[PDB]
Ligand binder design. Structure first.
Ligand SMILES: C[n+]1cn([C@@H]2O[C@H](COP(=O)(O)OP(=O)(O)OP(=O)(O)O)[C@@H](O)[C@H]2O)c2nc(N)[nH]c(=O)c21
Ligand code: NA
Length: 112
């Protein structure tokens, strides 16, 4: 179902010992469940996390969240970090679960 890729790849980097990781700002974009999606990502060299989710529509919201969770498993990206981004949302996503926008955990789910 999911189709997309990195419109802004994170930085690929080499760790001591030769391992290849990803860090810094990135953007993944594509279509999940008939919805255009942008996922803004950051990472510090030890983990990678969601900063914001941007959707073209909420018509398939909970299905899109499940597709985002599955993609984040493949990309090694968590939803445990409290993003500083706020505004333009009714809900945030935290641990891949929907929370009211009043909360501070996780990241906004912004319908554009
Ligand atoms: C570019 N990139 C690649 N990956 C990881 O590597 C998988 C393949 O990611 P990919 O489809 O972008 O292919 P590739 O990394 O080989 O890029 P190419 O060589 O130019 O064709 C992804 O499913 C992730 O596990 C990445 N994972 C993260 N977190 N961030 C990135 O920017 C990233
Ligand atoms: Na970290």
């Amino acid at each position: 179902g999911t189709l997309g890729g990195f419109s802004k790849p994170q930085k690929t980097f080499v760790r001591p010992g030769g391992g290849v990781g990803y860090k810094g700002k990135g953007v993944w974009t594509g279509v999940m469940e008939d919805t255009h999606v942008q996922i803004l990502i950051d990472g510090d060299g030890t983990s990678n996390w969601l900063e914001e989710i941007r959707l073209s529509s909420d018509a398939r919201l909970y299905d899109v969240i499940e597709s985002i969770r599955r993609l984040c498993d493949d990309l090694g990206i968590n939803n445990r970090v409290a993003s500083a981004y706020r505004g333009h949302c009714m809900v945030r996503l935290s641990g891949f679960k929907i929370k009211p926008a009043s909360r501070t955990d996780g990241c906004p789910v912004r319908i554009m």
